[PDB]
Design an enzyme around this catalytic site. Structure first.
Site, PDB file in Angstrom:
ATOM      1  N   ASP B  63       0.832  -1.193   0.000  1.00  0.00           N
ATOM      2  CA  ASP B  63       0.000   0.000   0.000  1.00  0.00           C
ATOM      3  C   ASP B  63       0.868   1.245   0.000  1.00  0.00           C
ATOM      4  O   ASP B  63       1.067   1.883   1.037  1.00  0.00           O
ATOM      5  CB  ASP B  63      -0.934   0.002   1.197  1.00  0.00           C
ATOM      6  CG  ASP B  63      -1.807   1.227   1.237  1.00  0.00           C
ATOM      7  OD1 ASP B  63      -1.862   1.960   0.226  1.00  0.00           O
ATOM      8  OD2 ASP B  63      -2.440   1.434   2.283  1.00  0.00           O
ATOM      9  N   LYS B  65       0.380   3.907  -2.126  1.00  0.00           N
ATOM     10  CA  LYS B  65      -0.352   5.039  -2.682  1.00  0.00           C
ATOM     11  C   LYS B  65       0.449   5.845  -3.706  1.00  0.00           C
ATOM     12  O   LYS B  65       0.591   7.068  -3.627  1.00  0.00           O
ATOM     13  CB  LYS B  65      -0.909   5.897  -1.556  1.00  0.00           C
ATOM     14  CG  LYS B  65      -2.060   5.176  -0.883  1.00  0.00           C
ATOM     15  CD  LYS B  65      -2.745   6.022   0.126  1.00  0.00           C
ATOM     16  CE  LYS B  65      -3.745   5.186   0.859  1.00  0.00           C
ATOM     17  NZ  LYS B  65      -3.117   4.049   1.608  1.00  0.00           N
ATOM     18  N   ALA B  67       1.937   8.032  -6.305  1.00  0.00           N
ATOM     19  CA  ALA B  67       1.336   9.308  -6.687  1.00  0.00           C
ATOM     20  C   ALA B  67       2.347  10.263  -7.302  1.00  0.00           C
ATOM     21  O   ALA B  67       2.351  11.461  -7.013  1.00  0.00           O
ATOM     22  CB  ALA B  67       0.671   9.959  -5.463  1.00  0.00           C
ATOM     23  N   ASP B  68       3.194   9.733  -8.171  1.00  0.00           N
ATOM     24  CA  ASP B  68       4.242  10.533  -8.777  1.00  0.00           C
ATOM     25  C   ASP B  68       4.041  10.631 -10.289  1.00  0.00           C
ATOM     26  O   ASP B  68       3.008  10.200 -10.823  1.00  0.00           O
ATOM     27  CB  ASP B  68       5.620   9.943  -8.433  1.00  0.00           C
ATOM     28  CG  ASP B  68       6.681  11.012  -8.201  1.00  0.00           C
ATOM     29  OD1 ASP B  68       7.303  10.988  -7.109  1.00  0.00           O
ATOM     30  OD2 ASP B  68       6.888  11.879  -9.075  1.00  0.00           O
ATOM     31  N   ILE B  69       5.013  11.244 -10.963  1.00  0.00           N
ATOM     32  CA  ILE B  69       5.026  11.289 -12.414  1.00  0.00           C
ATOM     33  C   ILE B  69       5.270   9.890 -12.987  1.00  0.00           C
ATOM     34  O   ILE B  69       5.727   8.987 -12.272  1.00  0.00           O
ATOM     35  CB  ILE B  69       6.103  12.257 -12.934  1.00  0.00           C
ATOM     36  CG1 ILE B  69       7.504  11.699 -12.680  1.00  0.00           C
ATOM     37  CG2 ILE B  69       5.935  13.639 -12.316  1.00  0.00           C
ATOM     38  CD1 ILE B  69       8.637  12.571 -13.233  1.00  0.00           C
ATOM     39  N   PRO B 173     -10.951  -0.063   2.884  1.00  0.00           N
ATOM     40  CA  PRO B 173     -10.486   0.290   4.229  1.00  0.00           C
ATOM     41  C   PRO B 173     -11.395   1.324   4.890  1.00  0.00           C
ATOM     42  O   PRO B 173     -12.225   1.964   4.237  1.00  0.00           O
ATOM     43  CB  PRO B 173      -9.114   0.912   3.952  1.00  0.00           C
ATOM     44  CG  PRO B 173      -9.317   1.637   2.651  1.00  0.00           C
ATOM     45  CD  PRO B 173     -10.380   0.838   1.864  1.00  0.00           C
ATOM     46  N   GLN B 178     -12.056   3.624  11.838  1.00  0.00           N
ATOM     47  CA  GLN B 178     -12.623   4.805  11.187  1.00  0.00           C
ATOM     48  C   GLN B 178     -14.148   4.823  11.152  1.00  0.00           C
ATOM     49  O   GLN B 178     -14.751   5.801  10.703  1.00  0.00           O
ATOM     50  CB  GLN B 178     -12.059   4.978   9.777  1.00  0.00           C
ATOM     51  CG  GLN B 178     -10.564   5.104   9.764  1.00  0.00           C
ATOM     52  CD  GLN B 178     -10.032   5.173   8.366  1.00  0.00           C
ATOM     53  OE1 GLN B 178     -10.454   6.015   7.573  1.00  0.00           O
ATOM     54  NE2 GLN B 178      -9.097   4.290   8.048  1.00  0.00           N
ATOM     55  N   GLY B 183     -19.597  -5.906   7.819  1.00  0.00           N
ATOM     56  CA  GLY B 183     -20.773  -6.454   7.163  1.00  0.00           C
ATOM     57  C   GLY B 183     -21.331  -5.579   6.049  1.00  0.00           C
ATOM     58  O   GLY B 183     -21.533  -6.046   4.924  1.00  0.00           O
TER      59      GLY B 183
HETATM   60  O1  LIG Z   1       5.053  17.854 -10.107  1.00  0.00           O
HETATM   61  C1  LIG Z   1       6.058  16.970  -9.861  1.00  0.00           C
HETATM   62  C2  LIG Z   1       6.561  16.700  -8.473  1.00  0.00           C
HETATM   63  C3  LIG Z   1       7.802  15.957  -8.254  1.00  0.00           C
HETATM   64  O2  LIG Z   1       8.358  15.886  -7.005  1.00  0.00           O
HETATM   65  N1  LIG Z   1       8.532  15.491  -9.339  1.00  0.00           N
HETATM   66  C4  LIG Z   1       9.792  14.853  -9.129  1.00  0.00           C
HETATM   67  O3  LIG Z   1      10.961  15.740  -9.356  1.00  0.00           O
HETATM   68  C5  LIG Z   1      11.910  14.934 -10.146  1.00  0.00           C
HETATM   69  C6  LIG Z   1      12.155  15.352 -11.578  1.00  0.00           C
HETATM   70  O4  LIG Z   1      13.218  14.699 -12.166  1.00  0.00           O
HETATM   71  P1  LIG Z   1      13.660  15.059 -13.641  1.00  0.00           P
HETATM   72  O5  LIG Z   1      14.494  16.329 -13.663  1.00  0.00           O
HETATM   73  O6  LIG Z   1      14.491  13.826 -14.096  1.00  0.00           O
HETATM   74  O7  LIG Z   1      12.427  15.243 -14.568  1.00  0.00           O
HETATM   75  C7  LIG Z   1      11.607  13.494  -9.788  1.00  0.00           C
HETATM   76  O8  LIG Z   1      12.284  12.909  -8.752  1.00  0.00           O
HETATM   77  C8  LIG Z   1      10.149  13.478  -9.661  1.00  0.00           C
HETATM   78  O9  LIG Z   1       9.531  12.371  -9.142  1.00  0.00           O
HETATM   79  C9  LIG Z   1       8.218  15.794 -10.753  1.00  0.00           C
HETATM   80  O10 LIG Z   1       9.122  15.573 -11.745  1.00  0.00           O
HETATM   81  N2  LIG Z   1       7.022  16.715 -11.027  1.00  0.00           N
HETATM   82  O1  LIG Z   2      -9.001   5.675   1.647  1.00  0.00           O
HETATM   83  C1  LIG Z   2      -8.004   5.086   2.362  1.00  0.00           C
HETATM   84  C2  LIG Z   2      -6.973   4.220   1.699  1.00  0.00           C
HETATM   85  C3  LIG Z   2      -6.049   3.419   2.502  1.00  0.00           C
HETATM   86  O2  LIG Z   2      -5.259   2.455   1.936  1.00  0.00           O
HETATM   87  N1  LIG Z   2      -6.148   3.423   3.886  1.00  0.00           N
HETATM   88  C4  LIG Z   2      -5.286   2.594   4.676  1.00  0.00           C
HETATM   89  O3  LIG Z   2      -5.922   1.343   5.180  1.00  0.00           O
HETATM   90  C5  LIG Z   2      -5.542   1.239   6.596  1.00  0.00           C
HETATM   91  C6  LIG Z   2      -6.619   1.446   7.637  1.00  0.00           C
HETATM   92  O4  LIG Z   2      -6.273   0.958   8.868  1.00  0.00           O
HETATM   93  P1  LIG Z   2      -7.287   1.084  10.075  1.00  0.00           P
HETATM   94  O5  LIG Z   2      -8.212  -0.109  10.056  1.00  0.00           O
HETATM   95  O6  LIG Z   2      -6.388   1.057  11.349  1.00  0.00           O
HETATM   96  O7  LIG Z   2      -8.103   2.399   9.922  1.00  0.00           O
HETATM   97  C7  LIG Z   2      -4.213   1.954   6.684  1.00  0.00           C
HETATM   98  O8  LIG Z   2      -3.071   1.211   6.499  1.00  0.00           O
HETATM   99  C8  LIG Z   2      -4.386   3.101   5.789  1.00  0.00           C
HETATM  100  O9  LIG Z   2      -3.301   3.876   5.455  1.00  0.00           O
HETATM  101  C9  LIG Z   2      -7.198   4.125   4.659  1.00  0.00           C
HETATM  102  O10 LIG Z   2      -7.405   3.805   5.969  1.00  0.00           O
HETATM  103  N2  LIG Z   2      -8.270   4.867   3.859  1.00  0.00           N
END
Ligand SMILES: O=c1cc(O)n([C@@H]2O[C@H](COP(=O)(O)O)[C@@H](O)[C@H]2O)c(=O)[nH]1
Ligand SMILES: O=c1cc(O)n([C@@H]2O[C@H](COP(=O)(O)O)[C@@H](O)[C@H]2O)c(=O)[nH]1
Lengths: 213, 214
Positions: B63, B65, B67-69, B173, B178, B183
């Protein structure tokens, strides 16, 4: 914050030897290094303290933290324990998720950077429409450090207006993704550069050239 | 589609190896699928994933998440699958190219991507919820087969299920701590994710047992 040459190295190489060597070569040009998950997941979190000790550099952990508050707190805690000076957090999951990060940064005397809009094409689908509001959310919460896209100078300009002249703004997308460091620094305080340097035959010469431009 | 014992997935967010391993071992009769996140992985290292697989013979969902390029997403997924993860959870909000980058590595290495469409916490209402239906549709249009949606909002969970159809796999989750009910969640989701209600319990196995009973 104080940053040598307004240039931040994105060290996204995935083996320790290469990453350390390359960072070493450009260390006369930079005192601030952004380390992300490509390196940390491949070599371990201990790599952060290794950079700090070998180079005396500030380390920004680019982890794009994007979870629920409870988990965000744990991630920030583990990251600051490992020596990171700052961490980059997504704003899209909302204010509670951001504040969880600000809380840990307060506790441990470190910094949060809020990512507001991204630089890649896909960013236009959902992030761009939310970006101004995300930035405003940050301001309203006292966030002082921000990340915005080199690839969209007009967007970078608006972010600057929203956050004001006293906030710190760093910007990736310069070089490989098509952004111009010079243009980027009209609005941002530092430009983030990855591949243009670390994939260069001579990274020192690549850094040297960026600085001259 | 994959097969999951008791429609219950353990969210293992303890941050030391000893505790995480012990607790997982104790609920192992009740679960063959474990979700491991950054709290554990950053604290103990990525080698912990192969440790869980070998010790328990369980499926592991990382898990992270993502969330990058696209370029960075590809690297994250490669490193994660190399470490033995069966699947990885990816955010949809950074858009289609970022998702596809993950799908590409999953195809290459014969693993799975789960697309996170809406989140369970209150802040999720600020930006994610407005985009959630479109994120889900984007996934469907790209052939995504595995989805994550929020236990805390059954009506939102119901909408997700409609969008992705009856053949898609949906995990959820927010059950327990939460406020979501296991169920009710399983009316729409194929499995409920549970963390604290189990791993913070005095008797983890008892907690899991009780959840299964309900
Ligand atoms: O809006 C976003 C946010 C980021 O942190 N990044 C990050 O900044 C870097 C860009 O690297 P590069 O100069 O090779 O394109 C990466 O490590 C990347 O994950 C991105 O390129 N655009
Ligand atoms: O929408 C989201 C997505 C997630 O993966 N998670 C994740 O699932 C888990 C929830 O754990 P918990 O049952 O203790 O609330 C965590 O590991 C957490 O980061 C979340 O709780 N809500």
């Amino acid at each position: 914050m104080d940053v040598m040459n307004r240039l931040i190295l994105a060290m996204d190489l995935m083996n320790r030897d290469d990453a350390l060597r390359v960072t070493g070569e450009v260390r006369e040009y930079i005192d601030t290094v952004k380390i992300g998950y490509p390196l940390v997941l491949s070599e371990g979190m201990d790599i952060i303290a290794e950079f700090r000790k070998r180079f005396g550099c500030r380390i920004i952990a680019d982890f794009k933290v994007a979870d629920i508050p409870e988990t965000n707190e744990k991630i920030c805690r583990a990251t600051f324990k490992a020596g990171a000076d700052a961490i980059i957090v997504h704003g899209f999951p909302g204010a509670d998720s951001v504040r969880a990060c600000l809380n840990v940064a307060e506790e441990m005397g470190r910094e949060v950077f809020l990512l507001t809009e991204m630089s890649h094409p896909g960013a236009e689908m959902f992030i761009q429409g939310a970006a101004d509001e995300i930035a405003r959310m940050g301001v309203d919460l006292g966030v002082k450090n921000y990340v915005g896209p080199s690839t969209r100078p007009e967007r970078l300009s608006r972010l600057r207006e929203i956050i004001g002249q006293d906030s710190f703004l760093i910007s990736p997308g310069a070089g490989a993704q098509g952004g111009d460091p010079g243009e980027t620094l009209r609005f941002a305080d530092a430009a983030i550069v990855g591949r243009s340097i670390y994939l260069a035959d001579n990274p020192a010469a690549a850094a040297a050239g960026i600085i001259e431009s």
